[PDB]
Amino acid sequence: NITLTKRQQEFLLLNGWLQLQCGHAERACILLDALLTLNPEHLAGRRCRLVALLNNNQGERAEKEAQWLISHDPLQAGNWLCLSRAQQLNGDLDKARHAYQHYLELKDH
Amino acid sequence: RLYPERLADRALLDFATPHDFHQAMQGLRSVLAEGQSPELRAAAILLEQMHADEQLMQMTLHLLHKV
Ligand SMILES: [Cl-]
Numbered sequence: 001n002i003t004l005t006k007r008q009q010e011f012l013l014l015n016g017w018l019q020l021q022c023g024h025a026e027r028a029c030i031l032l033d034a035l036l037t038l039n040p041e042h043l044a045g046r047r048c049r050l051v052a053l054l055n056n057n058q059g060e061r062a063e064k065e066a067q068w069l070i071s072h073d074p075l076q077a078g079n080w081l082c083l084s085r086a087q088q089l090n091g092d093l094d095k096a097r098h099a100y101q102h103y104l105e106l107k108d109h
Numbered sequence: 110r111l112y113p114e115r116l117a118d119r120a121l122l123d124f125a126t127p128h129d130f131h132q133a134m135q136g137l138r139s140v141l142a143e144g145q146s147p148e149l150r151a152a153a154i155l156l157e158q159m160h161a162d163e164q165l166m167q168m169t170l171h172l173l174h175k176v
Contacts, residue, residue: 002144004137011133015156018170020125027155034141034152044127051125078124081117100112 004038013045020052028052043073050082059089077106130167130176 004012012035020028032049036042046069053062066083073079084099134156141153159166170176 002140002149004140007133008137008140010127012137013127014170014175015166017125017127018166018173018175021122021173022169027159030151030155033148034144037144037146037148048125048127051121054121078120081120081124085117085121104112 002038004035009035009039009042009045013042013048016045016052017048020048020055025052025055029056029058043069047078054082054085054089057089059086062086063090075106077103080106130170131163134163 012031016028016031016035019025019031029049029052032045032052035045036049039045046065050062050065050069053059053065063083063086066079066086069076069079070083080099080103084096084103087093087099088096138153138156141149141156144150144153167176
């Protein structure tokens with residue numbers, strides 16, 4: 001049994017974001033996968049890994065992770081923007097356009 | 110322009126932005142070193158590979174006003 005403390009979860013999250021912000025998308029996914037294995041309910045890590053998967057050209061994993069956030073947090077408009085990009089990387093431009101519309105609608109509330 | 114796609118990339122990276130470094134890194138490596146799953150074993154090897162970059166990582170995070 002393995003656990004991370006609250007400060008350790010944030011330290012692992014900031015390092016995952018650092019690699020993303022600094023253009024190391026795969027390192028971000030590697031670090032944030034470990035974070036979300038030990039705390040799969042960490043939303044900030046879910047969002048960071050999602051955009052990390054997009055920049056790592058992993059549209060398949062990104063689509064499922066965009067769906068996960070749409071399910072467990074449907075109010076956040078940024079979830080549909082991520083689904084739009086993932087479905088775009090997956091070639092389904094029709095779906096990507098529909099997910100982008102819901103992103104525009106949800107931004108206006 | 111009809112659609113603000115020029116702001117899409119900036120919006121994605123804002124969406125991903127979350128709201129002592131040496132000691133914290135050595136502590137996290139300590140915990141991840143015991144995980145047997147592939148995810149923890151992959152991240153433990155990565156954090157060990159970036160060990161020579163701790164000062165650079167702390168400096169960059171400090172400039173980004175995060176750590
Ligand atoms: Cl030391």
